Structures are given as C-alpha cells and as structure tokens.
C-alpha cells in the first residue's frame, strides 16, 4: 500500500528532469541567437547581388 | 494517508513541465520560420545562377516520412 | 484519500508530454537534414564564383 | 487496490522520458555543431566576393 505508492512515484527524478528541461531551454536560446547572426549574414549576401 | 498523498501529488510539477515543453515548442516553431526565410534566399540565388547553364536541380527537402 | 490519489497520478498526461517531446526531436532531425541540403547549394555557389 | 496501483504506475514512463530528453539533447548538440560549420562556410562569400 505505502510501498506501492512509493514505487509508482519518483519525485527526485521529476526534479532532475525539470532541471534538464531548463538546460534544454538555454540551448534553444543560444541556437536562436546564432540563427539570428547567420540570418544577418545571408541577408547581406542576398542584398549584394 | 494524507502525508503519503501529499508526497505522491505532483499536479503543480507536471503542469510546470508541460508548460515548459510548450515553451520549447514555440521556440522551435520560431527557428523553423527563420530557417525557411534562409532557404528562400539561397534557393533563389542558386536558381538565378542556374539559368542558361546545365546545373542540376539539387534537393531542398529531405524525404517523405515512411 | 481516494480523490487525492486521483489527483496524484495521470499516466495519460505523462504519455501526451512524452509524445510531445518526441515530435520536437523529429523536428530537430528534419531541420538538420534540410540545413545540410542548404550547405550543398552554397558549396556549389562558392565553386561558381 | 491492485488495478488502481497498475494505473498509478509511472516507473517506466519517467525512465523512457529521460531517454527521450537525452536523445533530444544529443540531437541539439549535433545540430549546433552543424550550425557552426554552416557559419564557417557562409563567411567565405565576402571572402570570394
């Protein structure tokens, strides 16, 4: 009863995966930034044609 | 009974994780849009180069799923 | 006690968010392959000029 | 409460969610390396022109 409800939940792993989701958010933000820079580069390529 | 229920309850936790994956999805759609705006200019430049020559049509999108 | 135990668990919500993160992985794979396809065209554009 | 205990079961789901988050993270690092290579290629445009 108590041990079954202990088995069916893993709260510490929820906290670890939430921290890992935050890490994924940071990586998404830095990829958006480098897409913005190479957007600027391709735009100034296409302007000078 | 209540204490086991309160350590087993993660309504707020699962709602926070679901909302954060929704933030990931919105940022991914934004990146997809910017990448499409890159594809327009590079494909139009290559097609402008292609006129009058025998240059091949290179692929632009990978494959249909399954 | 019973309704609190209902509030503890949703297997379906965890399954929806698991499919929701798998489709984002699929989107990453499509963007990587498409960006390499862009790389081939810009390589031939370097070769042209 | 055996059937409610089987519907409580989350132990497989959190583990495979960790696998999904891990493979998403590896996919984003590989695409970021591809992004760096792509910037290195597209800077050669104004070197040539």
């Amino acid at each position: 009863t108590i041990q079954t409800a202990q088995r069916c939940d893993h709260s510490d792993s929820i906290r670890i995966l939430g921290e890992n989701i935050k890490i994924l958010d940071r990586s998404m933000k830095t990829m958006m930034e480098t897409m913005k820079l190479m957007m600027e580069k391709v735009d100034l390529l296409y302007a000078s044609t | 009974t209540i204490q086991t229920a309160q350590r087993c309850d993660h309504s707020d936790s699962i709602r926070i994780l679901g909302e954060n994956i929704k933030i990931l999805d919105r940022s991914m759609k934004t990146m997809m849009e910017t990448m499409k705006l890159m594809m327009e200019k590079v494909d139009l430049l290559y097609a402008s180069t292609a006129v009058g020559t025998s240059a091949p049509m290179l692929p632009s999108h990978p494959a249909p799923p399954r | 006690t019973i309704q609190t135990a209902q509030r503890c668990d949703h297997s379906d919500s965890i399954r929806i968010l698991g499919e929701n993160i798998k489709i984002l992985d699929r989107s990453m794979k499509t963007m990587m392959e498409t960006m390499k396809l862009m790389m081939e065209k810009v390589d031939l554009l370097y070769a042209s000029t | 409460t055996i059937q409610t205990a089987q519907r409580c079961d989350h132990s497989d789901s959190i583990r495979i969610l960790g696998e999904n988050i891990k493979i998403l993270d590896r996919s984003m690092k590989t695409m970021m390396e591809t992004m760096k290579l792509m910037m290195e290629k597209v800077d050669l445009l104004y070197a040539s022109t």
Binding site: - | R26, L44, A47, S48, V51, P56, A63 | - | -
Partner: protein, 1648 residues
Amino acid sequence: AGINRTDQSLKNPLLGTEVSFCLKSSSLPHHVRALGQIKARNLASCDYYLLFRQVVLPPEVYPIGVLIRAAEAILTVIVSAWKLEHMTKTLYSSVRYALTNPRVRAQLELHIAYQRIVGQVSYSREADIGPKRLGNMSLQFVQSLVIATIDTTSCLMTYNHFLAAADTAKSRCHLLIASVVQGALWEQGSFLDHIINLIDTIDSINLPHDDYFTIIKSISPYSQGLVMGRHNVSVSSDFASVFTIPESCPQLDSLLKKLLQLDPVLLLMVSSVQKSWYFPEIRMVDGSREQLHKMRVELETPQALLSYGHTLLSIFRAEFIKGYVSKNAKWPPVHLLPGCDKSIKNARELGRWSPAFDRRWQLFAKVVILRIADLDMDPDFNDIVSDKAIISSRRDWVFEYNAAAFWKKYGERLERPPARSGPSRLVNALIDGRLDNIPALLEPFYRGAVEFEDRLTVLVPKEKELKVKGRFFSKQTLAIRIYQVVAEAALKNEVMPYLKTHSMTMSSTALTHLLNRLSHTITKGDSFVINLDYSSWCNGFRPELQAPICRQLDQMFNCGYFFRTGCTLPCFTTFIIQDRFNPPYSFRGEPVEDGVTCAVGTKTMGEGMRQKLWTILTSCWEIIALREINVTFNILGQGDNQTIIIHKSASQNNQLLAERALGALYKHARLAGHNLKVEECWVSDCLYEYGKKLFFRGVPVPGCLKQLSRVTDSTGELFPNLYSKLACLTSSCLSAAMADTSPWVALATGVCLYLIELYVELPPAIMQDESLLTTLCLVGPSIGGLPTPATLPSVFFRGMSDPLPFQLALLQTLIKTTGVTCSLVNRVVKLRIAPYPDWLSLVTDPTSLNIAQVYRPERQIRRWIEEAIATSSHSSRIATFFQQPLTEMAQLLARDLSTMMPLRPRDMSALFALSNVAYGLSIIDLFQKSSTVVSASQAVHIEDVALESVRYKESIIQGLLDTTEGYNMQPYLEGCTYLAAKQLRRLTWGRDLVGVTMPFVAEQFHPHSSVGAKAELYLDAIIYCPQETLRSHHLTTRGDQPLAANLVKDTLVLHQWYKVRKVTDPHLNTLMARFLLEKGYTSDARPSIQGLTGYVNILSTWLRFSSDYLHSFSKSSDDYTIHFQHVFTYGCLYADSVIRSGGVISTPYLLSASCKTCFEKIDSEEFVLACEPQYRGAEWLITKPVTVPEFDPCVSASYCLGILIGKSFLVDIRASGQDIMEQRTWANLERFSISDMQKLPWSIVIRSLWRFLIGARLLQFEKAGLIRMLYAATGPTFSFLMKVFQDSALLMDCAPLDRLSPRINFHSRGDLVAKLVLLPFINPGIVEIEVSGINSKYHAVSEANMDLYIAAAKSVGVKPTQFVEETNDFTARGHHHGCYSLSWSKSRNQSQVLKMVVRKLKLCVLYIYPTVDPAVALDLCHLPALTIILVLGGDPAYYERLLEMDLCGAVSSRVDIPHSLAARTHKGFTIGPDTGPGVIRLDKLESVCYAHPCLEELEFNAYLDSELVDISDMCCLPLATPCKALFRPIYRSLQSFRLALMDNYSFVMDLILIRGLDIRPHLEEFDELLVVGQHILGQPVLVEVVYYVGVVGKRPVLARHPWSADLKRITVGGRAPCPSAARLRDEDCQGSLLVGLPAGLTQLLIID
C-alpha cells in the same frame, strides 16, 4: 499508302516553313513535284488571302429552288404546330429573301463548292489528286502542299491555308443568313447592306500582311472605344485614340462611325465577329525569339520582388483567416511570432474578426498559419484522361522535327531512335501503367530534385488567332502534368473557398446578385467599371514573387517544398518550339541553345500553368491598391482580364476617384513586375464584359452574329460522316438558343444550314424531291431519324422536356396541312422494333424507345473497347477496375430495375445513378468520347476509317433511296398525342411506362383574345392582362410587374424522399443497403439530409398572369399534368409573336384548355420492386472509401413553418430597401404549394410564430422595423401571409383567432393579418391565455428536413368548406332591427337605396360595372337568391379586389365567373352606366324627410329607366349572423371596446419608448379608435385637437392641454360623430366605463 490530308476543318496554326524549304533546295520526292508545277509569278504563302479573294463562280450553278420551297414548308409546319399562325408570313419570307438575294446565294454556292472539294480530297490514299477547278481557280494537291492558280499567278501553300479559305467562306455564309433572319425579326430593319459593305471594305484593303491583320485585330476595341467615347456620362475615355484605323483604312472608319450613328448595339454586334476574315501565317523566327526573350526578362529587381511577395503574403493570410473565421467560427491553427500585436492575440482568444484588420494587414506578418489539411496525391480519372498531349521523356524531342531539314540546316543526321520511347498521350500512360504510383512519381517534386528526364516543355502556337507573331501553349512531360493536376485541385478545393473575392465568383447566386446590382446601378450614376488587361500575364510571373506564398501553402498542407518546386523549376527546364522544318541542333542527344528555337532555362513555367495561384496573387495586389485609397470595390477575375466595380463616394466625384484608382492599380501592378500599359486599360459607366458576354447600359448585347458564324471542329471521336455534322449543327443552334439568342432566328438558320449540309452530301435524286426533304427534316432522332433542330422543344424552353408528343404533333401537322401521305412518313421513318428489350437504353435515356437507330455511326462502344483495354492493359488500375464485365453487370442491374410493378423510368434512372457501375460506364465513356481519346481510337486501324467513311456514305444513300415502308404509324398520328406517345411506348417496350410522358403545351392550351371569347372558353383559362398597350418598345424596356462519395448523400436523400411518401419494399431497402455497402457506409441508419426563359423576361414584366383554371383542375388536392413554367413561357411567346409580327397588345388575352385527354390525374402510387436484386454490389470502383463518421408530421411542420416565417420576417427587417423588393427568402419560401397550407392546421403555426417572436426579444430599432413594415404593405413574406390567408376558412378555423377577433379592430384584411402577427409585442393579454400551448419537442424539429415533411403535409389534412354570412335583405313589411350595412366609414345610404331597388324590382340577375364602389358590390353579393355577373372584359383585377375585402365567401359563391369575364356590354339590369334602358341611376335630392317606417332620412333618390319608382313603402325582414361587413369587432357591448381602449392606450405608451419609431400613424390608429370612443364620451368633441404627447419620468403623458413643456404637439383633425352607432351604443348606467378606467383614459374621456 497511309491516309492523307486527314482534316476537314482548321485545327492548326498556319506555318510557312515547309513552303520555304520546298522553294529553297529540297530533295524530297513530293517537293520536286510541287516545285515543278508553280508559275513564274508565284506569290508568298502569307499572301494566300490575296489569291482566294479573287475566286468567282458563274451565277446560279446549283439547283437549290427545291431547298427554298422545302424550307418554307418546314417553317410553316412548325409555326402551325405551335399554333402561332400570325408569325407565319414573317419567317418564310426571311428565308426566301436570303436564298434569292444574289450575294448571299453566291456565298452559299462558294461554300458548297469548297465543301465538295474538301469531301473529294480529304481522307484519301492518293498522294496526288489532280486538277480540281473552283471557278477561275484550279487547285492541285500534292500531299500536304496545295498549288492554286487563276490566270498566270500561282501560290504554293499548305493544306491548312486551303482549309482557312474554306472556313472563311463557311463563316460568311452563316453570317449572311443569320443577318437576314435577325433583320426580319427585330425593330430595326435590315442591316444586310452594312454587312456586304463591311465585306467589300475589308476585301478592298491592299496593305502588307502584318498591317492587314493589325486592322483585323483592332477592329473590335476601336468600335468599343467609339461607343464608350459617345456614351460615357461620368467618366472620360481616350481609348479610341490608340488605334490607327482612321489613318490606315478611312472607309472602314466611315462605316464604323455611321453604324455608331444609327445604332450602338448594332455596332457592338457587327464588330464582335473576328473569324469571318482570313487567318494569319505566323512569323516564327521573330515571334519565337520574342517569346524566349519575354520568358527571361526582368523589369524589377529580385530584391524588390521578394519584399513585395512578403507584402502579398500578409494580405493572403488576412483574407484566409477572415474566410476561415466566417465559415468555421474559429481561428485556424496559427503561431504568433515575437512582436505580434495584442489585438491579434485578443481576437484569437475571443474567436472573432475585428472590423479594423482590413486596413491593417501588415500585422499579419507575424501570424504563421499551420497545418489545415493534407495534400491529396491521387487524382480522379476525370482530369487524368483528357485535354492535353504529353511527352514521355526528353529523348522524344527528335520526333517533332524532320530529318531532311536537320541534314540541310546543320550538315549531319538526326540519329533518331526507332521507337518513340513510351506513350504520347495520357490514356496510353494509363494503359501502360506509368500512372500506377502517383506519390512515387511526385516524390521528386517533394524533395525538390525532379529528375533529369522530366525537364522539357514544347511551346506550340495556337490556332485561329489574329496575332502575327503567335501565342504559344505548353506541351509538357507527364510528371509536370500530374503536378499541375494535384496543385490546381488542392488550390481549387481547399484554399479558394476561404478567399472571398474568388468565392463570390465561384458561387452562382452571389455572382447573379452582384451582376443584377451592377445592372441597376450603372444607369443611375454610381458603380463605374475599370477594365484591366494584362498582355504579358503568364510570361511576367517570376520566382521571387511566388516563393513566400508557396512556402505558406507548403506549411498549410504538410507537403515539403511541393508548392515551391514550381517557382524554381523553369530555371532548370529545356524549352524547344514545335516547328517542323526548323529544327534545333543536337550535340550529345540534347538540344543546343540558340535563342530562336531553344532555351536552356527560363524564369516562368508558361501559359496555363499555375493558373489558380496567379489569380490569388493578382487579386492580392489589386486589394492592396484599392484598400490604400479607401474605395468600395468588387473584383471579377477572369485571369488576364480583370473587371473592377467601384461604387461612388459622397465626398468625391467619379472622375477623380477613377484617376486615383488607376494610379494605385498602375503602382501596385508595376511593383509585382506586371506593368500595365495605359493603351490597354479603360474605365466606363456604360459598357462592361463578363463571361464572354457584353453588356451595354446594363442590357446584354445580342450574340446571334458571333455564335451562328462560329466554325466547330465536328466529327468527334469518329470518321467523317453526315450524322456528326447534323449533330454538331443541332448542338450549335441549341447552345445559341440557350445563350440569349432568339428561338426563331436559330431555328430558321438551323433549317437553312441543315438543307445546305444535306445538299453537299446527297445525290440529285433525293435533293430534287420536295416532300422527301420536308419529311426528312421533320422525323428527328426521337423516332430514329437524323438529328434536326426542328424537333427540339429545348429551343423554346429551359427545363427538362419530352420530345415525343411534340414530334407526333409535327407529323400530324405535316399530314393534315402539307400534301404528304402517311405512306411517305412510313417510308422515311422505317420504324423497326427490337426483338428483345434493352433496359440499359431506358436507364440512360428515360424518354427513348426500343427501336433501331440505323443512321447512328457505329463504334461498338459497350464491349469492344472494354475487351481491348482488358487485353492490352499491361499493369494495374485497369485490371482492378475492369476485373469483371461492366456491361453485363449493368444489364443485370437494369433487369433488376425492370421488375418495378408500376414501371417508372425516371425513378429507374435515378436509382441507376446511385450505383458504382454507372460511374464505371462513365469512365468508359471518357475512354471513348472525350479529348485526346480520339487519337487512340482513330489511330488503331488508322487506314480503315477512310474505307468506313465510304461504306457509311453508300449505306446512307442506299437507305434513303429505298422505297419500302416500315411499321404503320397511322394509329399513332391521329387523335391525342399524349395517349399516342403512351401507346407507342407500350407497343415498343412491352410494358406501360408511368411518369415520363409530358403533354405538348400547344395542344394542351390554345391562345385566344378576349374580344370574341365566349363563356365556355373561361371555364379553364389562364388570363394575361397588360398594364399598357404593348409595342416594340416594351420588348427591351423593363416594366412594373415583378419577375466521389457525395453520391452517398444522394443515396440517403432520395431514400428519404422514398420514405416520407410511404413507399415501403424489402427489395428496394435491400438494394439501397447494397449501394451503401459498396460505397463504404456500413451504418444501419442515418436520418439526415415566374422566371421563364430569358428571351421573354423583359416582356413578362408588362403582364399579369394568374391561375384561374381551378374550375376543373385546381379545386382539389389531386395533382394533374401541367408544367406551369412551360405554359407561362408559351403565353409570353404568344405576346412576343404578336408584337414581332407588327401587332399590338391592347386587350387581355387567354390560354384556354383544348385537349381534355392531356389533363391526366397523376397517380401518386407506390412502386414495389418485385424480384430479389441480383446486383450484389461491386466495391472495387470507388477507390476512396468514405468513413462512417463522414409525432405526426403536421405539428412538426407547423412549428418549423412558424419559426421559418418568423426568421424570414426578421431577415426582411434586416434587409435594405433594394433587397426587400426582391423575393429572396431565408429558406426558399416561394416554391411551396397553397393546398398543403390549407391542409395544415394554422393555429399551431400562429402560436409557434408568436412564441418565436417573444423568444427573440428584439431591440427597439428592429421592433420599430417590424411594426413599420407590417403596418405598411411591404415585404415578400407579408404577401406570402396574405396569399395563405386569401381564403377565410383558415381565418375562421383558427380557435385563438375567433376569440381574439372581438378585441382587434381591423380596417382591412391586411390590417387584421398585421395585428395577428405583431400583437404579442404590443399586447401580452391574450398571450397570458395562449402561452400554455408550448411543446419543446416540436421546437427542436430541424429546418433542413422540413421540405421532407412538406411531402407529408399534403396528404394528411383536409380543406374546410367556407360559409355564407348574411346582410340586410329588406323586402315586404316588417320590424326594423337596426338597418346595419357599412356604417364603418363609407356611404351606407348608397347601399341602402340599391338594396331597396333591387328587392322591389324582383331581379334575379344583376350586372355591375367596375365604376361602382366595391363595398356596395359586397352588399349586393351578400344578398341571397341573386346572381351578380360583373363586367370585367377579361381583367380579373376588379373581382380579386372585391374578393379580398370580404370575410365570408359569398363573393366567391354568388358571382358567375365565366360569364363575368366574358361580359363586355349592357345585357340586362345594370348599376353603373349613366343613362339607358335597364340602368339604375342615383339622383341627388337636396331636401326630403323620407317618410319610411325603416330608415330616418334620405340623401340620394334612386331613378331607373328615366323614372322614379316608390321605394318609400318597403321595410325589413329578420337578420341572422353577420359577416365582417357589419364589423362585430366593435359591436354594441362596450367591455370589449373598453378592453380595446385599455389596449390602444397601452399600445401607444409602449411604442413611444420604442427607439426609431415616431408615433404618427399608430397614433392615427389610436385616433380612429378614440373617435369610436368620442361617439359615446358625451363631452364636446373638438374637430382639431392640439393633443400634446411626451414622456415624463418614464411615464408617457398625452392629452390635449400640455401637462408639461416637454410634451410634443401632434395635429389631429377631422373628428366627428358620423356613424349611427353613436346613438346605438348609448347605454344605461353611465359611469360603468369609469369603473375600471385608467386615470389617463378618464382624462381623455372628460375633454379639458
């Protein structure tokens, strides 16, 4: 050898490269023979029209007088059969004038000579056909090359040049005959002299080739510019100044200006012909170089074009989201980018489109539209098989060019492969199975790398166009054609219904409404028209403009890069131009770029490709240009031609607005790379063009000259034969008569052309026999003859028709009038019944017979093509589709449907239409009879069709010359043709056929005029009454009086139409269950769902026609065989024939019933399908299987009709003034019967209507609209409610209404209807009693199934009996009751003296002239034992107005209706003329006390027969229950009137608070009811009351003296105690009215 010169009409461009190759160094064997026969003076091939113009024949070479006599006989027979015998002299004199006039006869003889040379030379195995003489010209045919010589000059040309000359002669013959027949039947007279002058003027032009065709090209816009220059009133025009006709051809300018001076409509008719003159020879080097330049030319930079494409993406997103919110009530799946506006976010959450997003579309650069649908990568078989020729692969470019030309031009051979490396057509690609896997074929378009072998396009010049440098279409590889099919289907189905500008054009009703509003508005001064023409439209589109919207479309349909591969595809595609004898070079098997014949890569796909996307792009930039300057506009798009409607603004005039609009359109056209030339665009307020139709001042220009002079291709999917020529001629006349050309013009022209087409092909033995020619034109395909225009009733009518009674009537007229025996008819028809019944011919054509069709050209069709494709098919999609015999399954299903016990062929065909086998036979029909399937079916045994033509010709000559007779048709050419047609169908099929025989309308009704009509003609008659004397002015000026899996849906709807009229059979349910299983619906049950012909429409607005045929056919619920649209069209054709023959319509006319056996009571009968169906289903023909998700009727119909009428009144009050004059309703209220409304109990309907109005609980402005439009006689539904409530039986049967009628005081019948419909808002008092009768289950009955319940409401109920009330009868001596007759507001004494006179003279019949006041006539009708016969003279308006006033039914019982309509003069004892024998007259007496025991005082002394007869001694007799002539709503008792005084005081005080309603007329109603109060009040009645009204403290204070300053003065005059009911109602116990009186009512009681 092979067949030569295989065309009989022009179907190709005229090219001259072969002639130049022949003249300069050819070594081909036939080129030497062609070069040896030319003269020293040899003209160029482009000058061929210079040589063919000099051809002249000797006069009167063909004996065609028997044709003229036969044509006159045929037209006399048709006009006699229609029983319109006053047009008779007009039509045959038109034909006699045409064929006797020398120029028309010479053109006809030239046409016969040309067509006989074409018949002699075409489809021949002989390479060289010798000297063939055409007048002064001798022709020599050397394969493809023709040499023409007159005296010493020669022209070497191709065979297409000779066909162009023959087509010119054919078109001119058509034009001259059509001009003569149109000039005979039209208010302006003959214009044949102008046509001959036009032909001579164009034939007199001696200019070079390009200048000549410049004039011929510019002849139509110059004349349109002249008409616009003279007849624009609000805008300026400089369109005529562009063209150089005044300086190049002055005589043509003079002719067009004099045609402008006489008649602009004649100028627009004459100027629109463009193919009766010759055709250009295309300058291929210059035009080819110019096209290949225009496909790769940049007018705008790519960087600006991509930015403007982003701008167009914004407005595309805005319009798509507006459409999706309007239809689906929600925002689509969208992603909002960073920086999106907050208004977009709030409107997304609220699910609403704000009315400020239209001018702010730049906000939609941050709204990305996500997936909405999925791309359907499996086309159906309809678009796959037809309309294009294809190329298999790029190694097949070498089969479009000659090897000898490649050797002479370049010095080496072509290295042509032996085989053609695959199919050359779409259907052959199906049979070889290259189209088995469409998604695997379209996968390279998804990846964006289409394969190397698919990138070729051949540019082909178009034919019969006046451009000397040519216009080219695209012949493409199979893969790109499949891409075009998928992309155009996706954009047409999924995107464009949400785009409003395209969606109004796709819908027929919205387009019709828009064009009608444009027709009314242009003449008043608003809504001018801008016409924009894009000359370089298909060449102008560039990748950078298209790419962002293509990216959005690729994201919308989850297809990767599919819409974006078409933008960058032309940059990789090789383009060559189809010109044999001018080939491109080959280097390694591939074409070499030169700029004239080849181009490796361009920037546009071509013409016709990406048609749907380009329309969206053009519409987007036009919406940007017009929305930046704040105009109200409507865009009608026709691709390259765009018509813009601009409505007038209050601030600015039309010229300044037109200049601003033109500047905006030029600016935003230039930004897209599509520069508009100022010489090509124009503005107007008098002329526009839509749908290949030209409108001048809102009226369509006649198109008789253009349509009848058009040359069609003919001989479709067959060898050349006479039957196909007669069929295409008949179809051309039918298409003309449907497309707003006069029936008589098309009929006479078709008869003439039919006889000329017979004269070309038939020997002199047939053609010099007049009676055989007349019979052979009057037999027709209904009874097995040749296709003739004479036997079609579809020329004069628009709906579905039955040819067979009309055909038998024509042959009866032929035998009785013309000296033709029945033995000759037996000779010509040759009736041959089949030995066994072929039921498939009945399920395809219900009206057909089981006879042999012997002149029909034979392709086996049913089995040979199925065997051929099932044997030669080398892959799937044919093996799965044709795994079982389709024809044997079709015959098995036909035998199953022939077991119907009443055999109904219409329902039999309808049930056959819901089958898979019908779809399968349709796909086989597209494999037989379509475009580009002629290639396969003619190419298999390509030689044998030449011998088959000769065999068919010998067979038809031997058949027509045979003198033996067939089956005797004498029983079927006597008596009634309805019964004769039914007996012929029973003889020929073996069983009686129910439901397909429609009676002939000219036999059923005969027209007469009222000046000599008797009483017996008026028993069953349809009456037409004109408001004015009608002449030729009224034919053109409008008058006052008004005018896939979807089969599964049908599989249920017909099922519901079976189930509600109570047909029940196990076998039919089994059969429809098998249909539902074969189409994939395995669910057990689902219960879910005036105007005339256009040629008499304008004339119909001057006539009132009604249905007074009820004395024998419309007094019962039993339905009969009358189709009323045909009958009203026939009566209007009688009027049109009287006007167009030189007469006038000044009297009413009639259509009387003549043949009593054409009126059959229809047997509403169950049909039981006897045997068990052996069909078993297919399930292999529908490739897309649909999914399963994809009480008594009287009360339900009562509640549904109540809520439908209530919401119809609601959409009437929301409608504007221009919209309420239209008869459009919410759910099609007009086409409902009147009988089933009488069966329907209407008390339930009135409570449903009342409870829907109280459930709406409308705001004050809409309630003011309700009360205003119901107190007036406005709205179509008020007319509908009057037409329902015409009989007083529905009035008396309503059990709420007999209780309610003491309360309401009604001035008229419409006043009572208005009070009944809008009483719950003003009075809840009776609503408190009859609100209890509510049932929520009947409110939940849906509207969409309502019509099905309409099928059930007709049979259950019954109609009431009607009752005769009584008025004062007088006679003898008696007691005086009160002498009550019309005391309401009318001279009662006029009725009194006439009742006393008619009772003492003891008259049995009284005749009443329409000068007498109607209410006196109501009293004279309500007297018993008297027959009132009015003098109508054919006009039912007086009796109808007399009937509308009465509320009992004594006017409908005591008036003899045929004798009343058949009466013109004095015939008895009358009231109404001034002085004469038997005339009752009224003489004014100034002073008499009238010593009479009955009545108190006399005003009028009645005189009769110049004598006075003593009316002073009579008295009354007892009375009984009265009508509403005595007005029991205000009777002697006052407590009902005090309740009315309680209510009208409460009516006005509630209506003061109503916004938008100023209470003057409702206050006048209150004034009349308070005049009824002022009769009894007893305080002095002011004639003028100053009567201040105003609200104080939310309480309306209203009285004579102003209680406060804020009260408003209303001037009321004319109050006096004139009725005698003032003395009657004066009662005992005064102050009883004060008991239970409001203090305001007491204040109105005691005056000041």
